Ligand binder design. Structure first.
Ligand SMILES: O=C(O)c1c(-c2ccccc2)oc(-c2ccccc2)c1C(=O)O
Ligand SMILES: [Zn+2]
Ligand SMILES: [Zn+2]
Length: 266
């Protein structure tokens, strides 16, 4: 007699869990996550913003990196998200408890976050994390301003219903740098065609390729840094091979077209 299987925790490559010191992207913007998961701190004269936190277990590390940058728990005003999967929104509930941060997100991301990632359209209850509530709901193209860094939301549904690119203008050497944090355009293990839980999935992805291609994009960053060819562990060379938003979108569309063909064959 065979019992039901134990629960299996989702495990990741060691580099996804490997702490790194803050890496400066532009005058106000730093990577403060691990070697292989993005978590961006944007520091202003009127508080700080975090875009993504990575996995559930990264909360204390993020807080240590914030302190190294001079940002206290009270100083963190706002959390934004690329999308609400465990590997990017992991530690959000814990950060809200340990800091002043409030969460702004679109309705789709807020609903999935409130679920802690459960009942995912594709992963089901396979990748759950602690639930969190959003404090503010944002619409496509809506702007949020903190200390004169202006973040604009660009909905790019597909990877999740609520996938979002966040764009802002920072500086380097007194010159503007248009940063684009574009969400994932992967479909890992997804049923793409005739999916009853996401009937217009393909059309949403195609529109999202177009959105990403057109973003204001001097520097592209992605939730998984490898997708945009970042190597955070390479210090001074971390961003040298980085893709343009146009190149990222083209590569993603080519991979998606291959996946569609394999699906039809399978
Ligand atoms: O966010 C996702 O859906 C992806 C995840 C993931 C999601 C939740 C928990 C653990 C991993 O891994 C990957 C991934 C796995 C291996 C290599 C690169 C990315 C994802 C992707 O392709 O977007
Ligand atoms: Zn994801
Ligand atoms: Zn991911």
């Amino acid at each position: 007699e065979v019992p039901l299987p134990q629960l299996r925790a989702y495990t990741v490559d060691a580099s996804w869990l490997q702490p790194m010191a803050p890496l400066q992207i532009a005058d106000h913007t730093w990577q403060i996550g691990t070697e292989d998961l993005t978590a961006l701190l944007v520091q202003t004269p009127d508080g700080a913003v975090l875009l993504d936190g990575g996995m559930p277990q990264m909360a204390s590390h993020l807080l240590d990196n914030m302190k190294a940058r001079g940002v206290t728990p009270r100083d963190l005003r706002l959390i934004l998200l690329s999308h609400a999967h465990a590997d990017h929104a992991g530690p959000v509930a814990e950060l809200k408890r340990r800091t002043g941060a409030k969460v702004a997100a679109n309705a789709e991301s807020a609903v999935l976050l409130a679920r802690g990632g459960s009942d995912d359209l594709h992963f089901g209850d396979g990748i759950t994390y602690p639930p969190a509530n959003a404090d503010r709901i944002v619409m496509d193209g809506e702007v949020i301003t903190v200390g004169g860094i202006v973040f604009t939301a660009h909905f790019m549904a597909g990877h999740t219903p609520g996938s979002t690119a966040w764009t802002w203008t920072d500086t380097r050497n007194g010159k503007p740098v248009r940063i684009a944090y574009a969400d994932s355009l992967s479909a890992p293990g997804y049923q793409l065609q005739g999916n009853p839980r996401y009937p217009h999935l393909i059309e949403d992805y195609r529109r999202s390729f177009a959105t990403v291609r057109a973003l204001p994009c001097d520097v592209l960053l992605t939730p998984h840094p490898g997708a945009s060819n970042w190597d955070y562990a390479a210090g001074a060379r971390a961003g040298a091979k980085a893709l343009t938003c146009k190149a990222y979108a083209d590569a993603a569309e080519q991979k998606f077209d291959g996946q569609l063909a394999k699906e039809t064959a399978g």
